[PDB]
Amino acid sequence: YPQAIVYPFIISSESYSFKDTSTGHKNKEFVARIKSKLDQGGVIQDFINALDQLSNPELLFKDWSNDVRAELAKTPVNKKNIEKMYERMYAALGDPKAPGLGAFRRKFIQTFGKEFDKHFGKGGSKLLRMKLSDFNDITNMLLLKMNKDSKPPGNLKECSPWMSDFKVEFLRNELEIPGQYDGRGKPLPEYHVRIAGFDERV
Amino acid sequence: ESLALAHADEKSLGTIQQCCDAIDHLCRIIEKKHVSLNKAKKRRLPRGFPPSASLCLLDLVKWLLAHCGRPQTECRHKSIELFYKFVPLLPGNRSPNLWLKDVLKEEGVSFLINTFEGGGCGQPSGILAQPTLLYLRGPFSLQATLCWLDLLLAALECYNTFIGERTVGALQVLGTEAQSSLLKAVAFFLESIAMHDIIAAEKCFGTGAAGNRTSPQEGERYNYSKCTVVVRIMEFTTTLLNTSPEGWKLLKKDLCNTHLMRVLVQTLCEPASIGFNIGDVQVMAHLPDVCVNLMKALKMSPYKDILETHLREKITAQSIEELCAVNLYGPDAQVDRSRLAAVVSACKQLHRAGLLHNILPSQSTDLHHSVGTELLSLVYKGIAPGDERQCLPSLDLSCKQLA
């Protein structure tokens, strides 16, 4: 049953660690094999990205005001762990062309990428370099983002092309509606309802 | 696309019928307005089409030709129908043969090969991606195994339709120019999958490493799709032999002509051994016609000797003599009656093709057929009481029919 395992495995694999002993290397190898058998197909990641394109593209920045403010101050040791932060944003907010990208996020990129690039620039080095109360510019960015959203995205075509033009063809693109393995009192058939399409109205 | 979506449906609903009527109405709409739709105006972009500024009917016929290799049955049939009905309405009045010449010439034969074997459109798939059922991965299921058979059915249908109507030459389209994968799939199905059951389709503890189970209806569902492909193989062979005078050299690329004769003579003697299910007259009515047509195709080809040689062991003038009178007209032993009926039906089918004398020739040479005389005598004396035990045989519906 490679789905009821794949969702919690993707949830858990975000935060892992491994020791330098032989047992740690064995665990790392086993996790690598599990990921290898679980990452086949690629339909799950496409579904995840398509559902992530439905997210409001300024609230993700608003939680940034919730995250790096934790870095601001304290930090007797600032550390280099904020290097994954900029990759996480630029893979979802900063990239002019990303897989599954719709028109709404493309417009947000075209209207704010150069803005925050000239605002900070090479954000990995600058954020650790400067540490003071200069971060009040989040209000200046967020007011413009809040008055720039304007109308809701509406239909699925402007949200995500993958969901609008989803199509199940033979011997591939197999997807199952999540939340069907109850795991109680009986084994599950795997007849489980599969995904055939999405309604165009959001 | 709605017709293609209605593949996994039932014939009682009427979706196929209504969608077909809608497609015919549309077809008539273009056929009455083709001169205005030929010019490249700016029209709405249909789903699945590449982005562009101007739409022509030529783009529509190219889309139909590309989607001619659809795994779905009715949608593929209609795709070929629209293609052949819409090619004449181009700016020229050229036949589809001449049109495919220049289109093949611009892009080589490999374009047509990828169209036929692509298993649809877009991403590479179909028998070219999976020539045999050994290329698949994952746990084997009854839903997944039928897809290969559907892809083979689609490839056979497009090749037969584009060869039998004198559209593209067989040597040009399936010769030695490039990879074909059609002969390989046909040989793999005829030798390794045909004359077998689902337990042989699942191999024997392959990469799945799971015995699992098999529902009783799963066997019938697999057998329907299995028997659907052997028939199309028979019309494919018949079409090749009848259309290509030099088609025997390409037929040698089958590499399993012995297995083709095996399935032919097994369909002769007892069709239900392969998997042909009784109950529907429609499926079993087409079987003798295609068998006779295949026989008449092989007889006028340099394959008469091998066909006759493989045929004799199955139908022999001595086997009928030793089987025709074994406790006949009895209340029991219906298996002998069924075997005699199967043998006589095979003899009738051999007479239809015109090979009855060769399979069972005269052995007396006295102006009187040896086997026919003995059959007459057996029928004429089997209704007699026999000896002097004063017992008159009784005849039922089956006994009278066999006599």
mmCIF file of C-alpha atoms in Angstrom, chain B residues 27-396:
data_model
loop_
_atom_site.group_PDB
_atom_site.id
_atom_site.type_symbol
_atom_site.label_atom_id
_atom_site.label_comp_id
_atom_site.label_asym_id
_atom_site.label_seq_id
_atom_site.Cartn_x
_atom_site.Cartn_y
_atom_site.Cartn_z
ATOM 1 C CA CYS B 27 -19.309 16.120 -39.459
ATOM 2 C CA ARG B 28 -22.193 17.117 -41.719
ATOM 3 C CA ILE B 29 -21.745 20.716 -40.538
ATOM 4 C CA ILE B 30 -18.111 20.800 -41.713
ATOM 5 C CA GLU B 31 -18.967 18.841 -44.880
ATOM 6 C CA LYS B 32 -21.507 21.517 -45.836
ATOM 7 C CA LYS B 33 -19.190 24.442 -44.957
ATOM 8 C CA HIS B 34 -15.646 23.282 -45.755
ATOM 9 C CA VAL B 35 -14.796 26.052 -48.243
ATOM 10 C CA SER B 36 -15.349 28.688 -45.531
ATOM 11 C CA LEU B 37 -13.511 26.713 -42.832
ATOM 12 C CA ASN B 38 -10.488 26.089 -45.078
ATOM 13 C CA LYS B 39 -9.216 29.676 -44.879
ATOM 14 C CA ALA B 40 -7.069 30.408 -41.820
ATOM 15 C CA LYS B 41 -9.294 32.695 -39.775
ATOM 16 C CA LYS B 42 -9.034 33.377 -36.031
ATOM 17 C CA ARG B 43 -11.231 30.907 -34.138
ATOM 18 C CA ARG B 44 -11.534 29.582 -30.599
ATOM 19 C CA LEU B 45 -8.722 27.273 -29.515
ATOM 20 C CA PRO B 46 -9.984 23.769 -28.625
ATOM 21 C CA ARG B 47 -8.576 21.937 -25.630
ATOM 22 C CA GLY B 48 -5.559 19.762 -26.376
ATOM 23 C CA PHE B 49 -4.501 21.825 -29.398
ATOM 24 C CA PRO B 50 -1.141 23.621 -29.402
ATOM 25 C CA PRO B 51 -1.350 27.406 -28.954
ATOM 26 C CA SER B 52 -1.643 29.352 -32.204
ATOM 27 C CA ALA B 53 -3.248 32.429 -33.765
ATOM 28 C CA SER B 54 -5.101 30.956 -36.769
ATOM 29 C CA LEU B 55 -7.005 27.671 -37.050
ATOM 30 C CA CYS B 56 -7.489 25.705 -40.272
ATOM 31 C CA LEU B 57 -9.217 22.434 -41.095
ATOM 32 C CA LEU B 58 -5.762 21.019 -41.869
ATOM 33 C CA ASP B 59 -4.869 21.381 -38.186
ATOM 34 C CA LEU B 60 -8.026 19.438 -37.311
ATOM 35 C CA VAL B 61 -7.196 16.596 -39.705
ATOM 36 C CA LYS B 62 -3.618 16.507 -38.378
ATOM 37 C CA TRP B 63 -5.031 16.224 -34.851
ATOM 38 C CA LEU B 64 -7.309 13.389 -35.996
ATOM 39 C CA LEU B 65 -4.391 11.584 -37.655
ATOM 40 C CA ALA B 66 -2.236 12.007 -34.539
ATOM 41 C CA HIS B 67 -5.038 10.691 -32.306
ATOM 42 C CA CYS B 68 -5.861 7.824 -34.693
ATOM 43 C CA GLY B 69 -3.795 5.523 -32.467
ATOM 44 C CA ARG B 70 -6.127 5.940 -29.509
ATOM 45 C CA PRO B 71 -6.406 2.949 -27.133
ATOM 46 C CA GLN B 72 -10.153 3.601 -26.885
ATOM 47 C CA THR B 73 -12.137 1.678 -29.486
ATOM 48 C CA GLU B 74 -15.091 3.790 -30.639
ATOM 49 C CA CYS B 75 -13.128 7.047 -30.487
ATOM 50 C CA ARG B 76 -10.361 5.535 -32.635
ATOM 51 C CA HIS B 77 -12.897 4.196 -35.146
ATOM 52 C CA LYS B 78 -14.464 7.646 -35.377
ATOM 53 C CA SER B 79 -11.001 9.232 -35.612
ATOM 54 C CA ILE B 80 -10.243 7.175 -38.720
ATOM 55 C CA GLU B 81 -13.752 7.900 -40.050
ATOM 56 C CA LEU B 82 -13.353 11.686 -39.711
ATOM 57 C CA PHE B 83 -9.811 11.474 -41.118
ATOM 58 C CA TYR B 84 -10.897 9.673 -44.294
ATOM 59 C CA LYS B 85 -14.011 11.847 -44.644
ATOM 60 C CA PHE B 86 -12.105 15.126 -44.161
ATOM 61 C CA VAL B 87 -8.924 14.561 -46.211
ATOM 62 C CA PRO B 88 -10.736 15.251 -49.547
ATOM 63 C CA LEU B 89 -12.018 18.617 -48.246
ATOM 64 C CA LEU B 90 -8.475 20.097 -48.104
ATOM 65 C CA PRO B 91 -7.438 22.908 -50.508
ATOM 66 C CA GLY B 92 -6.509 20.118 -52.919
ATOM 67 C CA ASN B 93 -8.655 17.184 -54.009
ATOM 68 C CA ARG B 94 -5.921 14.598 -53.469
ATOM 69 C CA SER B 95 -6.710 11.119 -52.192
ATOM 70 C CA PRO B 96 -5.470 10.092 -48.719
ATOM 71 C CA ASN B 97 -2.818 7.925 -50.404
ATOM 72 C CA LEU B 98 -1.233 10.907 -52.172
ATOM 73 C CA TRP B 99 -1.641 13.117 -49.092
ATOM 74 C CA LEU B 100 0.117 10.594 -46.852
ATOM 75 C CA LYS B 101 2.824 10.199 -49.489
ATOM 76 C CA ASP B 102 3.826 13.893 -49.237
ATOM 77 C CA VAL B 103 3.194 14.054 -45.437
ATOM 78 C CA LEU B 104 5.215 10.823 -45.039
ATOM 79 C CA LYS B 105 7.825 12.279 -47.445
ATOM 80 C CA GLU B 106 8.158 15.508 -45.389
ATOM 81 C CA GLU B 107 8.612 13.575 -42.105
ATOM 82 C CA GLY B 108 9.750 10.083 -43.087
ATOM 83 C CA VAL B 109 8.030 6.831 -42.201
ATOM 84 C CA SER B 110 8.949 7.244 -38.516
ATOM 85 C CA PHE B 111 6.188 9.845 -38.144
ATOM 86 C CA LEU B 112 3.593 7.282 -39.251
ATOM 87 C CA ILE B 113 5.180 4.580 -37.075
ATOM 88 C CA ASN B 114 5.030 6.824 -34.000
ATOM 89 C CA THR B 115 1.453 7.787 -34.894
ATOM 90 C CA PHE B 116 0.336 4.152 -35.110
ATOM 91 C CA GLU B 117 2.361 2.767 -32.181
ATOM 92 C CA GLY B 118 2.229 5.828 -29.911
ATOM 93 C CA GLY B 119 -0.733 4.588 -27.875
ATOM 94 C CA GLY B 120 -2.546 7.913 -28.089
ATOM 95 C CA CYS B 121 -0.650 11.203 -28.272
ATOM 96 C CA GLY B 122 1.912 13.316 -26.461
ATOM 97 C CA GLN B 123 4.072 11.294 -24.092
ATOM 98 C CA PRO B 124 5.624 8.180 -25.691
ATOM 99 C CA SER B 125 3.574 5.119 -24.758
ATOM 100 C CA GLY B 126 1.784 2.200 -26.369
ATOM 101 C CA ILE B 127 3.465 -0.974 -27.653
ATOM 102 C CA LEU B 128 6.515 1.125 -28.634
ATOM 103 C CA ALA B 129 6.974 2.003 -24.894
ATOM 104 C CA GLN B 130 5.875 -1.502 -23.790
ATOM 105 C CA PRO B 131 6.313 -4.041 -26.651
ATOM 106 C CA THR B 132 5.732 -6.989 -24.241
ATOM 107 C CA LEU B 133 3.958 -7.262 -20.860
ATOM 108 C CA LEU B 134 7.432 -7.698 -19.326
ATOM 109 C CA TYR B 135 8.110 -3.922 -19.487
ATOM 110 C CA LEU B 136 5.403 -3.086 -16.931
ATOM 111 C CA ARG B 137 6.177 -2.428 -13.269
ATOM 112 C CA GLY B 138 4.262 -2.670 -10.015
ATOM 113 C CA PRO B 139 1.810 -5.191 -8.571
ATOM 114 C CA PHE B 140 -0.086 -6.913 -11.366
ATOM 115 C CA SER B 141 -3.838 -6.281 -11.406
ATOM 116 C CA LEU B 142 -6.711 -7.175 -13.717
ATOM 117 C CA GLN B 143 -7.195 -3.498 -14.607
ATOM 118 C CA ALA B 144 -3.567 -2.920 -15.626
ATOM 119 C CA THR B 145 -3.041 -6.045 -17.750
ATOM 120 C CA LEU B 146 -5.896 -5.213 -20.141
ATOM 121 C CA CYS B 147 -4.295 -1.885 -21.111
ATOM 122 C CA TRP B 148 -1.494 -3.638 -23.001
ATOM 123 C CA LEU B 149 -4.101 -5.658 -24.922
ATOM 124 C CA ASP B 150 -6.023 -2.458 -25.698
ATOM 125 C CA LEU B 151 -2.853 -0.816 -27.040
ATOM 126 C CA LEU B 152 -2.155 -3.870 -29.207
ATOM 127 C CA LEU B 153 -5.768 -3.765 -30.434
ATOM 128 C CA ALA B 154 -5.399 -0.090 -31.353
ATOM 129 C CA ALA B 155 -2.132 -0.668 -33.220
ATOM 130 C CA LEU B 156 -3.607 -3.622 -35.120
ATOM 131 C CA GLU B 157 -6.703 -1.587 -36.013
ATOM 132 C CA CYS B 158 -4.793 1.418 -37.370
ATOM 133 C CA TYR B 159 -2.353 -0.765 -39.320
ATOM 134 C CA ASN B 160 -5.140 -2.890 -40.828
ATOM 135 C CA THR B 161 -7.227 0.168 -41.731
ATOM 136 C CA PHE B 162 -4.301 2.019 -43.320
ATOM 137 C CA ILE B 163 -3.052 -1.057 -45.215
ATOM 138 C CA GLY B 164 -6.310 -2.568 -46.491
ATOM 139 C CA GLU B 165 -7.589 0.662 -48.064
ATOM 140 C CA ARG B 166 -4.448 1.109 -50.228
ATOM 141 C CA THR B 167 -3.323 4.166 -48.257
ATOM 142 C CA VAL B 168 0.286 3.180 -47.476
ATOM 143 C CA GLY B 169 2.235 0.210 -48.791
ATOM 144 C CA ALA B 170 2.903 -2.558 -46.286
ATOM 145 C CA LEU B 171 6.598 -2.781 -47.191
ATOM 146 C CA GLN B 172 6.945 0.994 -46.821
ATOM 147 C CA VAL B 173 5.166 1.153 -43.464
ATOM 148 C CA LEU B 174 6.332 -2.020 -41.652
ATOM 149 C CA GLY B 175 9.440 -3.077 -43.560
ATOM 150 C CA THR B 176 13.055 -2.742 -42.408
ATOM 151 C CA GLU B 177 13.265 1.066 -42.493
ATOM 152 C CA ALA B 178 12.975 1.661 -38.742
ATOM 153 C CA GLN B 179 11.702 0.179 -35.492
ATOM 154 C CA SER B 180 8.146 -1.177 -35.671
ATOM 155 C CA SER B 181 7.474 -3.254 -32.514
ATOM 156 C CA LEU B 182 4.226 -4.504 -34.121
ATOM 157 C CA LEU B 183 5.625 -7.834 -35.311
ATOM 158 C CA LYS B 184 7.381 -8.258 -31.957
ATOM 159 C CA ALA B 185 4.143 -7.662 -30.010
ATOM 160 C CA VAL B 186 2.209 -9.993 -32.327
ATOM 161 C CA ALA B 187 4.815 -12.748 -31.934
ATOM 162 C CA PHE B 188 4.925 -12.303 -28.152
ATOM 163 C CA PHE B 189 1.134 -12.491 -27.855
ATOM 164 C CA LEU B 190 0.708 -15.420 -30.262
ATOM 165 C CA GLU B 191 3.473 -17.589 -28.780
ATOM 166 C CA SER B 192 3.574 -16.758 -25.060
ATOM 167 C CA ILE B 193 0.074 -15.456 -24.219
ATOM 168 C CA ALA B 194 -2.224 -17.180 -26.720
ATOM 169 C CA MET B 195 -3.385 -20.745 -25.985
ATOM 170 C CA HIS B 196 -3.011 -19.981 -22.269
ATOM 171 C CA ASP B 197 -4.962 -18.626 -19.288
ATOM 172 C CA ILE B 198 -4.586 -15.741 -16.833
ATOM 173 C CA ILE B 199 -2.209 -17.844 -14.704
ATOM 174 C CA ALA B 200 0.213 -17.731 -17.637
ATOM 175 C CA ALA B 201 -0.498 -14.026 -18.156
ATOM 176 C CA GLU B 202 0.687 -13.446 -14.578
ATOM 177 C CA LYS B 203 3.792 -15.571 -15.445
ATOM 178 C CA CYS B 204 5.053 -17.548 -12.401
ATOM 179 C CA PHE B 205 6.212 -15.480 -9.396
ATOM 180 C CA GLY B 206 7.773 -12.627 -11.345
ATOM 181 C CA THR B 207 8.873 -9.261 -9.976
ATOM 182 C CA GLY B 208 5.529 -8.952 -8.179
ATOM 183 C CA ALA B 209 6.364 -11.886 -5.863
ATOM 184 C CA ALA B 210 2.729 -12.335 -4.829
ATOM 185 C CA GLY B 211 0.464 -15.276 -5.595
ATOM 186 C CA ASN B 212 -2.684 -13.257 -4.752
ATOM 187 C CA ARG B 213 -6.036 -14.653 -5.960
ATOM 188 C CA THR B 214 -8.252 -14.510 -9.056
ATOM 189 C CA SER B 215 -11.981 -13.818 -9.137
ATOM 190 C CA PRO B 216 -14.137 -16.033 -11.400
ATOM 191 C CA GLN B 217 -15.345 -13.009 -13.386
ATOM 192 C CA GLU B 218 -11.747 -11.797 -13.757
ATOM 193 C CA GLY B 219 -11.049 -14.855 -15.901
ATOM 194 C CA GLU B 220 -13.920 -14.055 -18.265
ATOM 195 C CA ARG B 221 -12.951 -10.369 -18.370
ATOM 196 C CA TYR B 222 -9.383 -11.309 -19.318
ATOM 197 C CA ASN B 223 -10.547 -13.954 -21.807
ATOM 198 C CA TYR B 224 -12.773 -11.515 -23.714
ATOM 199 C CA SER B 225 -9.848 -9.153 -24.323
ATOM 200 C CA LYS B 226 -7.554 -12.105 -25.077
ATOM 201 C CA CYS B 227 -9.879 -13.524 -27.742
ATOM 202 C CA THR B 228 -10.463 -10.053 -29.201
ATOM 203 C CA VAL B 229 -6.810 -9.771 -30.264
ATOM 204 C CA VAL B 230 -6.397 -13.158 -31.997
ATOM 205 C CA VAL B 231 -9.285 -12.323 -34.345
ATOM 206 C CA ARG B 232 -7.737 -8.979 -35.311
ATOM 207 C CA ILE B 233 -4.450 -10.822 -35.884
ATOM 208 C CA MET B 234 -6.275 -13.134 -38.308
ATOM 209 C CA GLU B 235 -7.739 -10.233 -40.312
ATOM 210 C CA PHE B 236 -4.314 -8.549 -40.215
ATOM 211 C CA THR B 237 -2.678 -11.627 -41.752
ATOM 212 C CA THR B 238 -5.507 -11.954 -44.284
ATOM 213 C CA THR B 239 -5.185 -8.289 -45.273
ATOM 214 C CA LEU B 240 -1.402 -8.531 -45.649
ATOM 215 C CA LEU B 241 -1.611 -11.672 -47.790
ATOM 216 C CA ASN B 242 -4.443 -10.367 -49.978
ATOM 217 C CA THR B 243 -3.006 -6.865 -50.482
ATOM 218 C CA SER B 244 0.754 -7.419 -50.777
ATOM 219 C CA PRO B 245 1.918 -9.891 -53.459
ATOM 220 C CA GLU B 246 5.387 -9.705 -51.871
ATOM 221 C CA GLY B 247 3.871 -9.830 -48.377
ATOM 222 C CA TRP B 248 5.193 -13.300 -47.554
ATOM 223 C CA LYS B 249 8.662 -11.851 -46.908
ATOM 224 C CA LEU B 250 7.169 -9.444 -44.364
ATOM 225 C CA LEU B 251 5.089 -12.317 -42.970
ATOM 226 C CA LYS B 252 8.361 -14.166 -42.333
ATOM 227 C CA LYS B 253 9.142 -11.387 -39.825
ATOM 228 C CA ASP B 254 6.366 -12.825 -37.631
ATOM 229 C CA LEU B 255 8.895 -15.518 -36.575
ATOM 230 C CA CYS B 256 5.944 -17.485 -35.124
ATOM 231 C CA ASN B 257 4.082 -18.791 -38.190
ATOM 232 C CA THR B 258 4.043 -22.196 -36.491
ATOM 233 C CA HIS B 259 2.256 -20.586 -33.536
ATOM 234 C CA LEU B 260 -0.111 -18.786 -35.926
ATOM 235 C CA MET B 261 -1.027 -22.142 -37.462
ATOM 236 C CA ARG B 262 -1.358 -23.490 -33.910
ATOM 237 C CA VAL B 263 -3.938 -20.884 -32.894
ATOM 238 C CA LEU B 264 -5.723 -21.261 -36.249
ATOM 239 C CA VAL B 265 -6.113 -25.041 -35.979
ATOM 240 C CA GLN B 266 -6.993 -24.746 -32.282
ATOM 241 C CA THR B 267 -9.759 -22.286 -33.161
ATOM 242 C CA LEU B 268 -10.841 -24.877 -35.738
ATOM 243 C CA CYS B 269 -11.159 -27.991 -33.584
ATOM 244 C CA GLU B 270 -12.453 -26.454 -30.335
ATOM 245 C CA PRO B 271 -12.706 -22.666 -29.954
ATOM 246 C CA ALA B 272 -13.585 -22.835 -26.248
ATOM 247 C CA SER B 273 -10.168 -24.293 -25.375
ATOM 248 C CA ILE B 274 -8.492 -20.959 -26.159
ATOM 249 C CA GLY B 275 -11.052 -18.994 -24.153
ATOM 250 C CA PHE B 276 -13.885 -18.223 -26.576
ATOM 251 C CA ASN B 277 -16.889 -18.088 -24.241
ATOM 252 C CA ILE B 278 -20.279 -19.459 -25.259
ATOM 253 C CA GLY B 279 -23.423 -17.433 -24.649
ATOM 254 C CA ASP B 280 -23.259 -14.702 -27.294
ATOM 255 C CA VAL B 281 -23.896 -15.565 -30.939
ATOM 256 C CA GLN B 282 -22.310 -12.315 -32.185
ATOM 257 C CA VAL B 283 -18.734 -13.184 -31.190
ATOM 258 C CA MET B 284 -18.844 -16.807 -32.374
ATOM 259 C CA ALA B 285 -20.614 -16.033 -35.665
ATOM 260 C CA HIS B 286 -17.668 -13.997 -36.983
ATOM 261 C CA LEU B 287 -15.162 -16.765 -36.169
ATOM 262 C CA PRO B 288 -15.869 -19.173 -39.094
ATOM 263 C CA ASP B 289 -15.934 -16.298 -41.600
ATOM 264 C CA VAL B 290 -12.540 -14.921 -40.571
ATOM 265 C CA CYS B 291 -11.123 -18.459 -40.358
ATOM 266 C CA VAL B 292 -12.281 -19.229 -43.913
ATOM 267 C CA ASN B 293 -10.960 -15.894 -45.203
ATOM 268 C CA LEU B 294 -7.579 -16.537 -43.567
ATOM 269 C CA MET B 295 -7.518 -20.025 -45.103
ATOM 270 C CA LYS B 296 -8.252 -18.681 -48.586
ATOM 271 C CA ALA B 297 -5.518 -16.081 -48.064
ATOM 272 C CA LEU B 298 -2.925 -18.680 -47.024
ATOM 273 C CA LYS B 299 -3.882 -21.038 -49.866
ATOM 274 C CA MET B 300 -2.988 -18.424 -52.516
ATOM 275 C CA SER B 301 0.367 -17.724 -50.816
ATOM 276 C CA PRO B 302 3.657 -19.628 -50.391
ATOM 277 C CA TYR B 303 2.387 -21.027 -47.077
ATOM 278 C CA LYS B 304 0.089 -23.794 -48.364
ATOM 279 C CA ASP B 305 2.463 -26.626 -47.434
ATOM 280 C CA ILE B 306 2.974 -25.586 -43.804
ATOM 281 C CA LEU B 307 -0.756 -24.922 -43.348
ATOM 282 C CA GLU B 308 -1.657 -28.352 -44.735
ATOM 283 C CA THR B 309 1.046 -30.079 -42.679
ATOM 284 C CA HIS B 310 -0.099 -28.433 -39.443
ATOM 285 C CA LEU B 311 -3.742 -29.165 -40.384
ATOM 286 C CA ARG B 312 -3.495 -32.950 -41.026
ATOM 287 C CA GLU B 313 -2.657 -33.975 -37.443
ATOM 288 C CA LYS B 314 -5.693 -32.019 -36.225
ATOM 289 C CA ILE B 315 -8.086 -33.437 -38.894
ATOM 290 C CA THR B 316 -7.192 -36.921 -40.164
ATOM 291 C CA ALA B 317 -9.199 -39.372 -42.280
ATOM 292 C CA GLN B 318 -8.451 -42.146 -39.764
ATOM 293 C CA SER B 319 -9.348 -40.180 -36.620
ATOM 294 C CA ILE B 320 -12.855 -39.492 -37.940
ATOM 295 C CA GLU B 321 -13.175 -43.177 -38.859
ATOM 296 C CA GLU B 322 -12.133 -44.327 -35.375
ATOM 297 C CA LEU B 323 -14.255 -41.694 -33.582
ATOM 298 C CA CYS B 324 -17.434 -41.639 -35.701
ATOM 299 C CA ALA B 325 -18.863 -44.861 -34.184
ATOM 300 C CA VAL B 326 -18.136 -45.220 -30.453
ATOM 301 C CA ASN B 327 -21.298 -46.186 -28.517
ATOM 302 C CA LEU B 328 -23.424 -43.824 -30.590
ATOM 303 C CA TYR B 329 -27.105 -43.019 -29.960
ATOM 304 C CA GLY B 330 -26.702 -43.667 -26.234
ATOM 305 C CA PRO B 331 -28.236 -41.877 -23.248
ATOM 306 C CA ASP B 332 -24.724 -41.110 -21.931
ATOM 307 C CA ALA B 333 -21.225 -40.278 -23.237
ATOM 308 C CA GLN B 334 -22.118 -36.826 -24.556
ATOM 309 C CA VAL B 335 -18.406 -35.974 -24.817
ATOM 310 C CA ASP B 336 -18.061 -38.247 -27.859
ATOM 311 C CA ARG B 337 -21.092 -36.540 -29.416
ATOM 312 C CA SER B 338 -19.585 -33.095 -28.779
ATOM 313 C CA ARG B 339 -16.210 -34.141 -30.211
ATOM 314 C CA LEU B 340 -17.881 -35.558 -33.329
ATOM 315 C CA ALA B 341 -19.878 -32.336 -33.732
ATOM 316 C CA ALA B 342 -16.688 -30.278 -33.411
ATOM 317 C CA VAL B 343 -14.922 -32.474 -35.982
ATOM 318 C CA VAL B 344 -17.803 -32.250 -38.464
ATOM 319 C CA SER B 345 -17.989 -28.460 -37.978
ATOM 320 C CA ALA B 346 -14.256 -28.206 -38.683
ATOM 321 C CA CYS B 347 -14.814 -30.304 -41.814
ATOM 322 C CA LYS B 348 -17.583 -27.936 -42.954
ATOM 323 C CA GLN B 349 -15.307 -24.939 -42.368
ATOM 324 C CA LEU B 350 -12.572 -26.707 -44.391
ATOM 325 C CA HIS B 351 -15.095 -27.297 -47.184
ATOM 326 C CA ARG B 352 -15.979 -23.590 -47.163
ATOM 327 C CA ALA B 353 -12.341 -22.663 -47.817
ATOM 328 C CA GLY B 354 -11.939 -25.462 -50.369
ATOM 329 C CA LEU B 355 -9.346 -27.729 -48.730
ATOM 330 C CA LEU B 356 -11.565 -30.653 -47.589
ATOM 331 C CA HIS B 357 -10.251 -33.021 -50.246
ATOM 332 C CA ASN B 358 -6.571 -32.254 -49.454
ATOM 333 C CA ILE B 359 -6.920 -32.730 -45.645
ATOM 334 C CA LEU B 360 -8.944 -35.951 -46.176
ATOM 335 C CA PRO B 361 -8.203 -37.260 -49.743
ATOM 336 C CA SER B 362 -9.579 -40.347 -51.527
ATOM 337 C CA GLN B 363 -7.914 -43.644 -50.626
ATOM 338 C CA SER B 364 -9.886 -46.053 -52.854
ATOM 339 C CA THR B 365 -9.829 -44.288 -56.270
ATOM 340 C CA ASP B 366 -12.967 -46.042 -57.525
ATOM 341 C CA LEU B 367 -15.061 -42.950 -58.401
ATOM 342 C CA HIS B 368 -16.575 -43.071 -54.860
ATOM 343 C CA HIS B 369 -15.256 -41.019 -51.905
ATOM 344 C CA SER B 370 -13.971 -43.356 -49.200
ATOM 345 C CA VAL B 371 -14.793 -41.288 -46.110
ATOM 346 C CA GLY B 372 -18.146 -40.023 -47.387
ATOM 347 C CA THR B 373 -19.353 -43.518 -48.246
ATOM 348 C CA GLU B 374 -18.521 -44.788 -44.738
ATOM 349 C CA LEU B 375 -20.242 -41.758 -43.187
ATOM 350 C CA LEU B 376 -23.348 -42.414 -45.310
ATOM 351 C CA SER B 377 -23.319 -46.094 -44.329
ATOM 352 C CA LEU B 378 -22.885 -45.188 -40.652
ATOM 353 C CA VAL B 379 -25.850 -42.804 -40.747
ATOM 354 C CA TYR B 380 -28.023 -45.203 -42.766
ATOM 355 C CA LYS B 381 -27.310 -48.164 -40.458
ATOM 356 C CA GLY B 382 -27.243 -46.248 -37.159
ATOM 357 C CA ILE B 383 -31.016 -45.756 -37.239
ATOM 358 C CA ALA B 384 -31.484 -49.507 -37.638
ATOM 359 C CA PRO B 385 -32.055 -51.592 -34.484
ATOM 360 C CA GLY B 386 -29.048 -53.761 -35.339
ATOM 361 C CA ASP B 387 -28.620 -57.534 -34.804
ATOM 362 C CA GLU B 388 -31.669 -59.281 -33.302
ATOM 363 C CA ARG B 389 -32.079 -57.819 -29.805
ATOM 364 C CA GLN B 390 -35.402 -56.118 -30.726
ATOM 365 C CA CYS B 391 -34.412 -52.621 -29.568
ATOM 366 C CA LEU B 392 -35.181 -49.579 -31.722
ATOM 367 C CA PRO B 393 -32.805 -46.645 -31.066
ATOM 368 C CA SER B 394 -34.392 -43.385 -29.946
ATOM 369 C CA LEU B 395 -33.306 -39.974 -31.221
ATOM 370 C CA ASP B 396 -33.310 -36.650 -29.371
#
